[PDB]
Enzyme design. Structure first.
Site, PDB file in Angstrom:
ATOM      1  N   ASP A   1     -15.069  -5.780  14.475  1.00  0.00           N
ATOM      2  CA  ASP A   1     -14.499  -4.532  14.969  1.00  0.00           C
ATOM      3  C   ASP A   1     -15.416  -3.323  14.783  1.00  0.00           C
ATOM      4  O   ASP A   1     -14.983  -2.196  15.049  1.00  0.00           O
ATOM      5  CB  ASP A   1     -13.160  -4.279  14.269  1.00  0.00           C
ATOM      6  CG  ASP A   1     -12.164  -3.548  15.146  1.00  0.00           C
ATOM      7  OD1 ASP A   1     -12.112  -3.831  16.361  1.00  0.00           O
ATOM      8  OD2 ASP A   1     -11.419  -2.701  14.610  1.00  0.00           O
TER       9      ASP A   1
ATOM     10  N   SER B   1       2.308  -0.050   4.388  1.00  0.00           N
ATOM     11  CA  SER B   1       1.834  -1.320   4.886  1.00  0.00           C
ATOM     12  C   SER B   1       1.674  -2.277   3.719  1.00  0.00           C
ATOM     13  O   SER B   1       1.751  -1.892   2.554  1.00  0.00           O
ATOM     14  CB  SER B   1       0.509  -1.155   5.623  1.00  0.00           C
ATOM     15  OG  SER B   1      -0.490  -0.729   4.719  1.00  0.00           O
TER      16      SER B   1
ATOM     17  N   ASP C   1       0.870   3.701   2.024  1.00  0.00           N
ATOM     18  CA  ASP C   1       1.357   4.101   3.336  1.00  0.00           C
ATOM     19  C   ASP C   1       2.494   3.222   3.839  1.00  0.00           C
ATOM     20  O   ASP C   1       2.971   3.438   4.958  1.00  0.00           O
ATOM     21  CB  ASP C   1       0.207   4.125   4.357  1.00  0.00           C
ATOM     22  CG  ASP C   1      -0.350   2.754   4.668  1.00  0.00           C
ATOM     23  OD1 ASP C   1       0.156   1.755   4.127  1.00  0.00           O
ATOM     24  OD2 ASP C   1      -1.307   2.668   5.469  1.00  0.00           O
TER      25      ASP C   1
ATOM     26  N   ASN D   1       0.826  -1.204   0.000  1.00  0.00           N
ATOM     27  CA  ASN D   1       0.000   0.000   0.000  1.00  0.00           C
ATOM     28  C   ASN D   1       0.860   1.255   0.000  1.00  0.00           C
ATOM     29  O   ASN D   1       2.054   1.224   0.307  1.00  0.00           O
ATOM     30  CB  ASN D   1      -0.904   0.003   1.228  1.00  0.00           C
ATOM     31  CG  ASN D   1      -1.799  -1.191   1.271  1.00  0.00           C
ATOM     32  OD1 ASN D   1      -1.893  -1.862   2.293  1.00  0.00           O
ATOM     33  ND2 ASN D   1      -2.473  -1.466   0.165  1.00  0.00           N
TER      34      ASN D   1
HETATM   35 NA    NA Z   1       4.756  -3.649   4.868  1.00  0.00          NA
END
Ligand code: NA
Ligand SMILES: [Cl-]
Ligand code: NA
Length: 129
Positions: free
Chosen positions: A101, A50, A48, A46
């Site tokens: 969640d 991640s 960001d 991703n």
């Molecule tokens: Na990662």
């Protein structure tokens, strides 16, 4: 491992995903198809920094530890590599925590955009379940 559609449906059912938090089995198979094309080894990075892992593309910022996502929570308490196994247990157990969640299956972008509101029972049609 690349699952067949009915093979994956049967594995998900055995692991308790049918109607888990009200989401019928077809929802889970549909999400897996468009998240990973049924491939347990799928990874995607991703913007960001991640990375998403496995048949349900579980993200390293919140759910698993991959050693390279700073400030990440490891809410499923698992290395992300465990989500790539041919045995889907670790992915299923973590997915159960995710879907509980608050936002349900909306946590999975592909489910929201490609499965939600469609006839998801078609994903298990014809399977011996
Ligand atoms: Na990662
Ligand atoms: Cl999408
Ligand atoms: Na990969």
């Amino acid at each position: 491992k690349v699952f067949g559609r009915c093979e994956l449906a049967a594995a998900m059912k055995r692991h308790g995903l049918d109607n888990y938090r009200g989401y019928s089995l077809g929802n889970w198979v549909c999400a897996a198809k468009f998240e990973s094309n049924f491939n347990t080894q799928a990874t995607n990075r991703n913007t960001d920094g991640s990375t998403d892992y496995g048949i349900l593309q579980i993200n390293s910022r919140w759910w698993c530890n991959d050693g390279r996502t700073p400030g990440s929570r490891n809410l499923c308490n698992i290395p992300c590599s465990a989500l790539l196994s041919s045995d889907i247990t670790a992915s299923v157990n973590c997915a159960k925590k995710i879907v509980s969640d608050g936002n349900g299956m909306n946590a999975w972008v592909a489910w929201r955009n490609r499965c939600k509101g469609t006839d998801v029972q078609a994903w298990i049609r014809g399977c011996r379940l």
